[PDB]
Amino acid sequence: ACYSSDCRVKCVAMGFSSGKCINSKCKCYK
Numbered sequence: 001a002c003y004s005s006d007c008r009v010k011c012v013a014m015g016f017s018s019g020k021c022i023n024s025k026c027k028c029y030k
């Protein structure tokens with residue numbers, strides 16, 4: 001599943017701004 005905290009942290013680790021869980025997907029904000 002997608003979990004909010006982990007998704008945000010994954011996204012930031014890759015150089016994105018943040019991210020959110022949408023429909024089971026961790027979608028990063030650029």
Ligand SMILES: [Cl-]
Binds near residue numbers: 002021022023024
């Ligand atoms: Cl979700």
